[PDB]
Design a protein around this ligand. Structure first.
Ligand SMILES: CC(C)C[C@H](N)C(=O)O
Length: 232
């Protein structure tokens, strides 16, 4: 094994890059739809126009919901949903995220005010010549992200922030845990090209690949493979 080790490294690196590239491409189109909705909203922000934009099938078929929230606390959501009493878009993570960035952004997983399930959102400020008229967002379910990741018997991919927080993992118990909390006995390190760590009495090899071309966030694909199966 100390002969083909540099070999295995090359396969694992290649698989990480491919997986990162797929997820980037999958997210990019969705990012573009939300940006386009924001650009269009900024053309005419009257609520009738906004509603009509947000009701179109390209958006409603791609996102669980798409919406605009503004600095007065008003919001429009399509498809319409009953929101909790007192719902204020200004305090929600999609809104504060977009307001803190010069470009589009993606949230970490959070609890959806609409459905009560764990989601991420894509969001961007809708600007008319330098002035923001509000924040436009769209929601994607965790289950959707988990399925996108498990699509492509050595091992599996997961998504982790560059702060070391697991964002999306096929084991749902590890969602939104730090690497340390998720792997307490022997912790993989994003600062290492490869981490050999024992899980349930087996050696796994873990590497991390940056996902290029996302706006505002720096996230990695983690790959974890059984060390015997990989060598075999
Ligand atoms: C705007 C709404 C559809 C809900 C949004 N995802 C939230 O939790 O704030």
């Amino acid at each position: 094994r100390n002969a083909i080790r540099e070999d295995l490294d090359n396969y694992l690196n290649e698989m990480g890059e491919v997986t990162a590239d797929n997820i980037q491409t999958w997210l990019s189109g969705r990012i573009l739809l939300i940006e386009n909705a924001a650009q269009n909203i900024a053309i005419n922000p009257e609520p009738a126009a906004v509603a009509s934009l947000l009701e179109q099938k390209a958006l409603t078929s791609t996102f669980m919901a798409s919406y605009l929230g503004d600095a007065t606390g008003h919001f429009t959501i399509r498809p319409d949903a009953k929101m909790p009493d007192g719902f204020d878009p200004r305090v929600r993570p999609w809104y504060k995220g977009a307001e803190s960035s010069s470009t589009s952004t993606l949230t970490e997983p959070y609890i959806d005010a609409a459905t009560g399930q764990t989601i991420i959102s894509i969001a961007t400020a809708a600007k008319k010549a330098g002035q923001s008229v509000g924040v436009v967002g769209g929601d994607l379910s965790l289950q959707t992200l988990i399925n996108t990741l498990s699509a492509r018997g050595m091992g599996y991919a997961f998504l982790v922030s560059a702060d070391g927080k697991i964002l999306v993992h096929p084991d749902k118990a590890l969602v939104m845990k730090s690497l340390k909390e998720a792997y307490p006995q022997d912790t993989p390190r994003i600062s290492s090209d490869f981490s050999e760590v024992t899980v349930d009495g087996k050696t796994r090899i873990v590497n991390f690949t940056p996902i290029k071309g996302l706006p505002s966030v720096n996230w990695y694909i983690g790959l974890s493979v059984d060390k015997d199966k990989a060598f075999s």
